[PDB]
Structure 1
Amino acid sequence: SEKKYRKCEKAGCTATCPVCFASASERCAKNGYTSRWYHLSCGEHFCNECFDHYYRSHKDGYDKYTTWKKIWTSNGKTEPSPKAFMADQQLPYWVQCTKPECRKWRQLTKEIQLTPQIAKTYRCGMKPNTTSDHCSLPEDLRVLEVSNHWWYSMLILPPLLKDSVAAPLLSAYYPDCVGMSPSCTSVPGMNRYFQPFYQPNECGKALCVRPDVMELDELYEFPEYSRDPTMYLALRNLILALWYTNCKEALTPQKCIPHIIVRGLVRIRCVQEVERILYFMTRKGLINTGVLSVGADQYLLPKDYHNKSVIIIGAGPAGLAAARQLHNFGIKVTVLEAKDRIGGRVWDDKSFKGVTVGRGAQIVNGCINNPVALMCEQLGISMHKFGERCDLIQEGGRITDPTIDKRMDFHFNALLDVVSEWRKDKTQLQDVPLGEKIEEIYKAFIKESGIQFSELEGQVLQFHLSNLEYACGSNLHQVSARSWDHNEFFAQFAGDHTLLTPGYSVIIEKLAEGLDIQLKSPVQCIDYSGDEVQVTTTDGTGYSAQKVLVTVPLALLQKGAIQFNPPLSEKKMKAINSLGAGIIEKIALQFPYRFWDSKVQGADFFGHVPPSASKRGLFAVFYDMDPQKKHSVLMSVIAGEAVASVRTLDDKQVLQQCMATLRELFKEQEVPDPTKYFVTRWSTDPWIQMAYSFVKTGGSGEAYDIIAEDIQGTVFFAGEATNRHFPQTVTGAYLSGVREASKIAAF
């Protein structure tokens, strides 16, 4: 009469007495003998009678199983089996007592389906969906087993979450390939800029994670998930979904737990992992970031990561970002800024009636997943997507026919295409200045083709040339042909380019809120010999801490303004000197009325066709600073060779030359005098001296990576000049501070 066993089917199982969790069949083995004891985990087994109850065609619960099967096979890629069925449909739920000093795990009865409402409110031995004696009872012994690694080793199937908050975003994916149950019959309200997941077979979008693939740095930290990442993916994806669903408060483990819905003891494992994973993504700045603020005893990282102190040099976006991160983590942070204000190259003039005019940055280039878009969401502020339209207006007042604009843009880009071909097989030593290579290709193309451009077509080509010089912040003869667009090899920020109407100052101010910031404290010296870094200001003040982070602009690193002891390495100096310190300047003009409205007809900007290639980049674009079209403020830009021509002019002389230009651009009409203006002088600001970085002839994009290497795990570097993927921008500077705060916290 066949054979029967007390013991589990799996050699090495730690259950000395399997007991059937199902009790689905009339002849369930309860806790005795059966023809096979089917193993789900070390703590969960079901007898063969209950196995036949669902499996065999002549048995009762066969319709229930066959129906689940059909749902399973059509929505998922994971095979259906009785074990998979049991784990998705028959294992009981486990929940923690929500009383703070208890937190004990309990098994719910079978008919109860775990809601996030139950998980938020459950207390020991009180019937859910609803004395303190029931808390003192010991947990089921199987609970403690779960937290060992060998428990996960002995788990036969990975968990599949139900009703994950991630699910509305992952519809393009098989639910089980991203850790969600296929038997689960279930993005309005989320910010259009939060797109944290790639769609399948999609790349080239910055800061998107693949919802079905762990990343290298994730596998490094969680190698136990390398073979089968189902479970890690489920929890990471859940945390991301929860964060972007509410980026204005800190996302705690307490907050994640009631959204982790899975049957069986494995839920305990998930609740224990979510917390580890959460602290990891916090340190890495993927969540719980932006201008989020925490109070005392509400720090974002456990007291372990708290045994450090940091001095941060420079209170620009990179410095304040690291300071805000490190502070939120619970690390002592002091920021020493040279100037008498924070912000660095973010400095918003607020004195123009009705608008905020930035003397430094005010544009966000690519808003999807951009942390600046995150921080705007957190602050409730709005960004203005730039319009496409930008007439090229001639001195004289003629508006250049758009087909000329477009045709010369074509020829121009066709020149850059030849550079990209030429450079493919050339090393850093073979490099050649970009402008020089363009002139060669152009003069070769003119000579070969016979074509003859009108004067205007040539001037319009000069305009497109000036824009490139603006993007590099340099005449193109200092810019590397090989490596000027180096960072476009990496995924870039998709989406809208915007004018940050309220100005970056609003973000910079909120980042700095509440931090120990010593202004008028320019750092003279950093000595990282000895047990602690010693930092000294220009008047002799001394500050001390265990680690120091440097965010000074590239120009200041090039000029050696801070004495380093020991000196920076030769490798680091060569990198620092291989990047160029690009420069632009800005002028803002306020008028008594919007004199351009009739001609410009609402566009966000208009173009200034340069008269000659010498005057190239002199007020090339005028920006209308009020997207609501009520106030009268224009802003324009000096780039390229034009920067060196106006160093010997005072502000009034620059203003006059701008006004002469506007009046030529509007020659057929009257232009009022300006009533208020400013002219920036970044290139002579002693502690900045630049607008943003670029790669000079002979250098490589790797220069950014090299400038970013820490020294002795003790001196760290951040700043736009240190972000290889995202050079130049406030965004790239911000992310580099987060990057460095992640490095520092790791110790």
Structure 2
Amino acid sequence: EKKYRKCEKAGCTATCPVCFASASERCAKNGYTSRWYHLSCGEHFCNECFDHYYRSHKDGYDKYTTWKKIWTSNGKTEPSPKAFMADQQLPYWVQCTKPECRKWRQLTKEIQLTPQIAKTYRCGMKPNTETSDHCSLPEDLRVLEVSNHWWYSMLILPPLLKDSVAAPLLSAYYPDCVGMSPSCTSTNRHVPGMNRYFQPFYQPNECGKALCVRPDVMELDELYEFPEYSRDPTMYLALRNLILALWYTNCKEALTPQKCIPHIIVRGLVRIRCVQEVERILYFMTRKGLINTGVLSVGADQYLLPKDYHNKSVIIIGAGPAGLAAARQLHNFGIKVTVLEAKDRIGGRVWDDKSFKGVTVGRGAQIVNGCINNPVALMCEQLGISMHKFGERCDLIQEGGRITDPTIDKRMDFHFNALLDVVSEWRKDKTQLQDVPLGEKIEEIYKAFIKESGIQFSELEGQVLQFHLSNLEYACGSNLHQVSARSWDHNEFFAQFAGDHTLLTPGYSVIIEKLAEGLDIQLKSPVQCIDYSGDEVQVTTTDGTGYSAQKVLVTVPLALLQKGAIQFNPPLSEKKMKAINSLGAGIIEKIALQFPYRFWDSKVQGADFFGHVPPSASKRGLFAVFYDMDPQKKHSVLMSVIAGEAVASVRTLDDKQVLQQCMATLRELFKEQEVPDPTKYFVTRWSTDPWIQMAYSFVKTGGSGEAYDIIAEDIQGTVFFAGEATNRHFPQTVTGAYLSGVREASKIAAF
């Protein structure tokens, strides 16, 4: 036969291929062979070692055949001698852990790389074990080759990771389809101790779950950033999935390259490319706020992004969830941030009262709707605090004291949802200019249904239907006659947060205060003018104090944008003003009442809340739901909500008059017994708080969900916008406001 000195592959850069396997007694070593098999520009094996495993009469055949059976039953990747070599025989490479050295070294071929070796390796030391004379030695010349893109081009098979920390979460997938080795026995074997709200990965063919990622498909922004993985995403996916698994395994500390590296176990020079790449992917996912986020804090020179991204200054207007999320992100990235807040406190529509004995009572937000993958649940895990999952039970108690039979509750809910289904059908072919108020469409459909069907409802059934109507006015923050029939539920077209609905028992203020800790926050500093006509943005407060930065982030409430309280120079565009004015500034108010004892326990029997059947439509929304504010059933605090048309009715009532109406309502709801006087209470006035004037946004008649995106659009890469009224997928909530701030910090840090 004819022998060859050179590699089989045209264009391979190895002038002298050497065999890494040396498995056969006739291994060609560094000389001639019938074929030099190419794995990479730095790695080859001779035909004698190929046959050692491949041919049925050679000594390596039993090992190759046993591997082969495991490979083909567990994965979708073809078996071959090359795949076998890369998975089983190619030597490992590891970095010196001396911080001033970090040189790559090849381990001898029988040394199995472990995390422990990757954490403790030093040049010249026996693995798993002097001076530092061996650190000075040059790296093998093949190491530098790996950093070029053409090296990856010439790598014939994608790497497959071993014992990935992501593997227990990915058992429904073929391992090689997510970049993991099919021969790995721990890969192919709820991560215990991981928070059950952390479900980072979609199961196969799954959708409809907010913030899950497909472990087997790259997203578009990943492809824009890493287009070299468009053809074969295997290697990128394994590193991204590993990073997510590690972050959600320990979300209380910054995830760094050095923490990831011992968990990257794969043979060959390609491990060098994997380690170089994991660092780039880490910075990308950090900037996007997918890891290293929440209430994580850093010190100086422990910034989360390298000093490149640091070269900016930012003024943030408003210190609510959105403003503080952006400030925490940007500060952690190493960017200079100043927060200007109009009020004498931080938090915005997060404002907790800590003066009720034994409980924390939000004047503003206190519920989390859907905890799975929710950043609020992440931050609770980081802070070690607990939430209370709501029970389903909610008796509808009538004035006079009767409890509504639950079959009436369900029946009238059935009828109410049927009306919304007709609206859903009616709108399928309607343009924005053909929009109709939801409340008007509902009332029309209902009257037509009574006429057509002839059905006769009791007075109680009609009042219970009014209750279900009031729940939707509560969710929208408005009487439905101002809400768009086309677009009221626009956001439900996107994946929503799954899982538990909870009461944030310790209060969102705990999270707000931790986000803000250590930041440069200026209270009682209402911004009056933002001028971005110069080289730097000029921000002036109402007392004439001037601030300047390269970029500015506006997070003020939608109602304050509608009233134009900040003057912009140049002015906001006509298109931006139309979007701003197409959304509604929804409103609810709250009352909280402390009592000497839990007078409701005998009748309510531990339920988290009870409903209040409205006696007339004129009273829809007036204290419709009462919340028991102690899930441990020890303290006696109720909270109730004023929603819909009821908000206008309490506008000209002072607090004592509201309290009096609420106590008259409670004594009607508990007419058969005595109700004690309250000993402490508050009544909120969000609608007249000058710097807020609302509770949460909704889409007004004629508007579109697209308005949320338009408000979110930056101006000139210089003026950015966040807040709950800028989050199209997740409007209204603390969660969506938080995510909007993280989003804007990502935009700002990219420049």
TM-score by length of 1: 1.00
Aligned to 1:306, what secondary structure does the other structure show?
coil
- Cα distance between partner residues in 1 of 2:736 and 2:101: 45
1:535 Cα deviation after fit: 0.1
1:723 Cα deviation after fit: 0.0
Which residues of 2 match residues 142-541 of structure 1 at below 5 A?
A: 142-186=142-186, 187-541=191-545
- Per-residue CA deviations over 1:1-38 (Å, capped at 9, x if unaligned) read x1111010110000001100000101000011111100
1:685 Cα deviation after fit: 0.1
- Cα distance between partner residues in 1 of 2:138 and 2:302: 30
1:681 Cα deviation after fit: 0.1
Is 1:669 the counterpart of 2:673? The answer is: yes
- Per-residue CA deviations over 1:328-350 (Å, capped at 9, x if unaligned) read 00000000000000000000000
- Cα distance between partner residues in 1 of 2:140 and 2:652: 82
- Per-residue CA deviations over 1:314-359 (Å, capped at 9, x if unaligned) read 0000000000000000000000000000000000000000000000
1:125 Cα deviation after fit: 0.7
- Per-residue CA deviations over 1:470-506 (Å, capped at 9, x if unaligned) read 0000000000000000000000000000000000000
**Structure 2 unmatched runs, 5+:** none
- Cα distance between partner residues in 2 of 1:111 and 1:221: 38
TM-score by length of 2: 0.99
- Cα distance between partner residues in 2 of 1:607 and 1:144: 69
1:157 Cα deviation after fit: 0.3
- Cα distance between partner residues in 2 of 1:93 and 1:37: 21
- Cα distance between partner residues in 2 of 1:597 and 1:335: 45
Aligned to 1:690, what secondary structure does the other structure show?
coil
Aligned to 1:103, what secondary structure does the other structure show?
coil
1:551 Cα deviation after fit: 0.1
- Per-residue CA deviations over 1:167-217 (Å, capped at 9, x if unaligned) read 000001000000000000001100000000000010000000000000000
- Cα distance between partner residues in 2 of 1:49 and 1:423: 72
- Cα distance between partner residues in 2 of 1:97 and 1:647: 70
- Cα distance between partner residues in 2 of 1:57 and 1:488: 60
Aligned to 1:588, what secondary structure does the other structure show?
strand
Alignment: residue pair count: 746
- Per-residue CA deviations over 1:260-279 (Å, capped at 9, x if unaligned) read 00000000000000000000
Aligned to 1:319, what secondary structure does the other structure show?
helix
Aligned to 1:580, what secondary structure does the other structure show?
strand
Once superposed, what is the RMSD of the aligned Cα atoms?
A: 0.3
- Cα distance between partner residues in 2 of 1:492 and 1:5: 61
1:306 Cα deviation after fit: 0.4
1:88 Cα deviation after fit: 0.1
- Cα distance between partner residues in 2 of 1:51 and 1:722: 60
Q: What is the match of residue 120 of structure 1? A: 119
- Cα distance between partner residues in 2 of 1:158 and 1:377: 36
- Cα distance between partner residues in 2 of 1:32 and 1:425: 75
Aligned to 1:113, what secondary structure does the other structure show?
coil
- Cα distance between partner residues in 2 of 1:132 and 1:649: 80
- Cα distance between partner residues in 1 of 2:192 and 2:462: 49
Aligned to 1:610, what secondary structure does the other structure show?
coil
1:154 Cα deviation after fit: 0.2
Aligned to 1:208, what secondary structure does the other structure show?
coil
1:742 Cα deviation after fit: 0.1
- Cα distance between partner residues in 1 of 2:436 and 2:605: 43
Q: What is the match of residue 73 of structure 1? A: 72
- Per-residue CA deviations over 1:659-693 (Å, capped at 9, x if unaligned) read 00000000000000000000000000000000000
Which residues of 2 match residues 509-658 of structure 1 at below 5 A?
A: 509-658=513-662
- Cα distance between partner residues in 2 of 1:114 and 1:76: 23
- Cα distance between partner residues in 1 of 2:694 and 2:456: 39
Aligned to 2:480, what secondary structure does the other structure show?
coil
- Cα distance between partner residues in 2 of 1:700 and 1:150: 48
- Per-residue CA deviations over 1:533-572 (Å, capped at 9, x if unaligned) read 0000000000000000000000000000000000000000
- Cα distance between partner residues in 2 of 1:569 and 1:181: 54
- Per-residue CA deviations over 1:66-109 (Å, capped at 9, x if unaligned) read 00000000000000000000000000000000001100000000
Aligned to 1:188, what secondary structure does the other structure show?
coil
- Cα distance between partner residues in 1 of 2:433 and 2:718: 33
Is 1:34 the counterpart of 2:38? The answer is: no
- Cα distance between partner residues in 1 of 2:325 and 2:734: 11
1:698 Cα deviation after fit: 0.2
- Per-residue CA deviations over 1:682-729 (Å, capped at 9, x if unaligned) read 000000000000000000000000000000000000000000000000
1:143 Cα deviation after fit: 0.2
- Per-residue CA deviations over 1:445-489 (Å, capped at 9, x if unaligned) read 000000010000000000000000000000000000000000000
- Cα distance between partner residues in 2 of 1:330 and 1:560: 32
1:153 Cα deviation after fit: 0.3
- Per-residue CA deviations over 1:517-546 (Å, capped at 9, x if unaligned) read 000000000000010000000000000000
1:365 Cα deviation after fit: 0.2
- Cα distance between partner residues in 1 of 2:428 and 2:334: 48
- Per-residue CA deviations over 1:108-127 (Å, capped at 9, x if unaligned) read 00111000000000000100
- Cα distance between partner residues in 2 of 1:566 and 1:30: 73
- Cα distance between partner residues in 1 of 2:330 and 2:664: 50
Aligned to 1:549, what secondary structure does the other structure show?
strand
1:302 Cα deviation after fit: 0.3
- Cα distance between partner residues in 2 of 1:4 and 1:213: 43
Is 1:719 the counterpart of 2:723? The answer is: yes
- Cα distance between partner residues in 2 of 1:650 and 1:132: 78
- Per-residue CA deviations over 1:402-422 (Å, capped at 9, x if unaligned) read 000000000000000000000
- Cα distance between partner residues in 2 of 1:132 and 1:36: 41
- Cα distance between partner residues in 1 of 2:301 and 2:225: 27
- Cα distance between partner residues in 1 of 2:641 and 2:195: 32
**Structure 1 unmatched runs, 5+:** none
Aligned to 1:699, what secondary structure does the other structure show?
coil
1:741 Cα deviation after fit: 0.1
1:280 Cα deviation after fit: 0.2
- Cα distance between partner residues in 2 of 1:224 and 1:647: 60
- Per-residue CA deviations over 1:30-70 (Å, capped at 9, x if unaligned) read 01111110000000000000000000111110000000000
- Cα distance between partner residues in 2 of 1:328 and 1:80: 46
1:128 Cα deviation after fit: 1.0
Aligned to 2:308, what secondary structure does the other structure show?
helix
1:393 Cα deviation after fit: 0.2
Q: What is the match of residue 18 of structure 1? A: 17
Structure 1 residue runs of 4 or more that deviate by more than 4 Å after TM superposition: none
Aligned to 2:641, what secondary structure does the other structure show?
strand
- Cα distance between partner residues in 2 of 1:3 and 1:396: 103
- Cα distance between partner residues in 2 of 1:579 and 1:235: 41
- Cα distance between partner residues in 2 of 1:637 and 1:587: 6
Identity, in percent, stands at 100
- Cα distance between partner residues in 2 of 1:176 and 1:132: 39
Aligned to 1:161, what secondary structure does the other structure show?
coil
Aligned to 1:303, what secondary structure does the other structure show?
coil
- Cα distance between partner residues in 1 of 2:324 and 2:270: 41
- Per-residue CA deviations over 1:131-162 (Å, capped at 9, x if unaligned) read 11000000000000000000000000000000
- Cα distance between partner residues in 1 of 2:382 and 2:696: 27
Aligned to 1:63, what secondary structure does the other structure show?
helix
- Cα distance between partner residues in 2 of 1:132 and 1:588: 68
